[PDB]
Structure formats: structure tokens, C-alpha cells
Amino acid sequence: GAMDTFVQHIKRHNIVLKRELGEGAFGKVFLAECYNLCKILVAVKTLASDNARKDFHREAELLTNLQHEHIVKFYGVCVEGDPLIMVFEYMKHGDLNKFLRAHGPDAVLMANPPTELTQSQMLHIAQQIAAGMVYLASQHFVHRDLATRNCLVGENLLVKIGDFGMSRYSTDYYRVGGHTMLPIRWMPPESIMYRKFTTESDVWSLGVVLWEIFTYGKQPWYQLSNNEVIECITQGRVLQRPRTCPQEVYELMLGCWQREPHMRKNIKGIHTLLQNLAKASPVYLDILG
Numbered sequence: 001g002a003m004d005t006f007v008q009h010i011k012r013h014n015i016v017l018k019r020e021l022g023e024g025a026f027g028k029v030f031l032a033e034c035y036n037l038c039k040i041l042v043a044v045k046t047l048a049s050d051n052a053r054k055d056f057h058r059e060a061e062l063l064t065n066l067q068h069e070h071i072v073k074f075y076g077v078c079v080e081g082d083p084l085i086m087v088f089e090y091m092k093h094g095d096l097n098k099f100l101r102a103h104g105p106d107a108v109l110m111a112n113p114p115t116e117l118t119q120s121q122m123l124h125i126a127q128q129i130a131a132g133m134v135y136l137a138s139q140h141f142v143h144r145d146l147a148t149r150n151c152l153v154g155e156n157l158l159v160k161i162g163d164f165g166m167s168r169y170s171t172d173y174y175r176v177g178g179h180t181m182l183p184i185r186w187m188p189p190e191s192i193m194y195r196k197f198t199t200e201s202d203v204w205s206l207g208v209v210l211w212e213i214f215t216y217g218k219q220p221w222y223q224l225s226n227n228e229v230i231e232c233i234t235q236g237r238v239l240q241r242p243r244t245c246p247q248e249v250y251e252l253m254l255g256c257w258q259r260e261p262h263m264r265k266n267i268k269g270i271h272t273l274l275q276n277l278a279k280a281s282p283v284y285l286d287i288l289g
């Protein structure tokens with residue numbers, strides 16, 4: 001919408017912080033009640049400097065414009081006091097990495113047990129992330145940090161992409177050149193070596209996300225140290241085919257993992273394939289935690 005261009009400002013008295021949400025990796029995030037927005041449950045992210053407030057509104061102006069069925073909904077801001085507030089939709093089931101691990105074979109055994117994530121459910125998660133990435137490419141927006149830890153799960157296995165690497169570093173990040181914290185395990189050779197981030201580097205990251213989904217949230221290249229990870233990526237080595245991954249899906253991953261960016265599969269093509277596989281293997285089983 002044209003109207004989304006403009007940042008929605010919310011009154012402080014219409015926000016009631018209820019409890020903490022996440023650990024968290026995104027700083028202090030709260031579960032809150034939001035009145036006269038249409039009351040609803042929301043997620044609140046907090047931020048206290050002339051330049052930092054300038055970047056806050058810049059970030060708010062970017063987030064307001066990115067609106068899609070598979071992008072975490074940005075509701076607006078509250079700049080009435082300290083700290084500054086960012087309001088997002090509440091995603092009941094939290095981060096996708098935690099969700100994948102909670103529905104893994106180990107979680108089923110070491111458990112009222114949870115249900116093991118099925119191949120049909122994996123494909124359903126995959127097509128939704130691919131849909132959100134198709135939208136970002138259409139808006140000429142480069143995420144730069146696509147990973148399951150940056151995706152959120154809602155009701156009816158609804159999955160949405162978020163964060164976009166804005167602000168925020170765990171073991172999933174490496175200090176590239178001793179200067180910038182970057183997610184090396186999810187990055188192609190050109191992003192590690194030259195810090196070139198494009199729609200094509202996001203395609204590589206989507207391939208790694210597909211590997212994360214099919215391995216129940218395992219860390220990519222888990223057997224390796226950070227230096228070994230960079231060596232494998234730059235040399236042209238690939239992640240192994242997951243046990244539960246069909247050959248068709250692994251070949252899609254290989255298409256994302258082409259060494260040169262111009263050789264990688266197009267985002268529209270990746271989404272169309274995942275959409276067709278998910279439609280042919282639909283979700284119908286009960287999902288327990």
C-alpha cells in the first residue's frame with residue numbers, strides 16, 4: 001500500500017508491557033497489549049542518542065514499507081520517551097530454529113512427547129520463507145541475514161521472515177577481517193571475501209535455510225571451526241544431503257550453492273518448485289509441543 005510509506009506512531013498509554021519475550025538475541029523484547037490499534041497482543045522492541053534516533057526513524061521508514069503475508073508485521077513506533085519503542089506482530093511459537101529443534105528426533109526421545117517434524121511440514125515451512133524472499137527481491141531489498149533464528153512461527157504452522165540483520169552476536173556470527181560480525185555459515189564466497197551482499201547471496205542463504213529445516217535446526221558445518229567453515233565455502237565444498245531430504249530438494253540446495261552468484265537459481269524458480277512440492281505433500285497431521 002501507498003499508505004504504508006508513512007510510519008504509524010502509537011501513544012505510550014496504549015502499550016502495556018506484559019513480560020519478556022525471547023532470551024534475547026534482539027535485545028529487550030517484550031510481549032505487550034496494544035490498545036486502539038486493531039486490544040491485541042504485540043511484540044515490543046526497545047532502543048538514546050541524536051544519531052541513534054536518526055537511524056531509528058530511518059529503520060522505522062524501511063520496516064513500514066516492507067509489508068507481505070510472509071514478512072513479520074511492523075505496526076509502528078512510540079518515540080514519546082526513553083527507550084524508543086518498535087511494535088511488531090506477536091508470533092506465538094517464537095523463532096524457527098528453536099521450533100525445528102523442539103520437533104527433532106532427539107526432542108521426541110529425550111521428552112508428553114512432541115511430534116517429529118514431517119517432510120510435508122518441512123516443505124510447508126520452506127515454501128513460506130521462499131515466498132517472503134520473492135517479495136524482498138521484488139522490492140530490491142537484500143536481507144543479508146536469512147537464517148531460521150531470524151524467522152518466526154505463528155499459528156497453523158504460519159512462518160514469516162524478519163529482522164533483516166538490523167541492530168542486534170552468538171556463535172552463529174564471526175568477526176570477518178576483525179571488523180564486522182557476519183553469519184559466515186549462511187554466507188557465499190563473495191559475501192565473506194568481498195562483503196558483497198545481493199539477491200544472489202540471499203539465494204545462497206536460502207539454500208542453507210533449506211538444509212537447516214531438513215536437519216531439524218542443526219547448525220550448518222557443525223563439525224567445523226569458523227576458519228574451516230570459510231575454507232570449505234571458498235574452496236567449493238558443500239553441505240551434506242540431510243537424511244530426511246528428498247533428492248529433488250537437495251538438488252535445489254546445490255542450485256543455491258553455486259560458487260559464482262550469476263550461476264545460482266533464481267528466487268522465483270526456487271519458490272515455484274517449493275510451492276508445487278508443498279501442494280503435492282500437504283500438511284494435515286496434528287502438531288504437538
Ligand SMILES: NC(=O)/N=c1\s[nH]c(S[C@@H]2CCCCc3ccccc32)c1C(N)=O
Pocket residue numbers: 021022026029043045072088089090091092093094095149150151152161162163
Ligand atoms: N514467541 C516469541 O518468542 N516471539 C518473539 S521473540 N522476538 C520477537 S520480535 C523480534 C525482534 C523484533 C523484530 C521482529 C523479529 C523478526 C524475526 C525474529 C525476531 C524478531 C517475537 C514475536 N514477534 O512474537
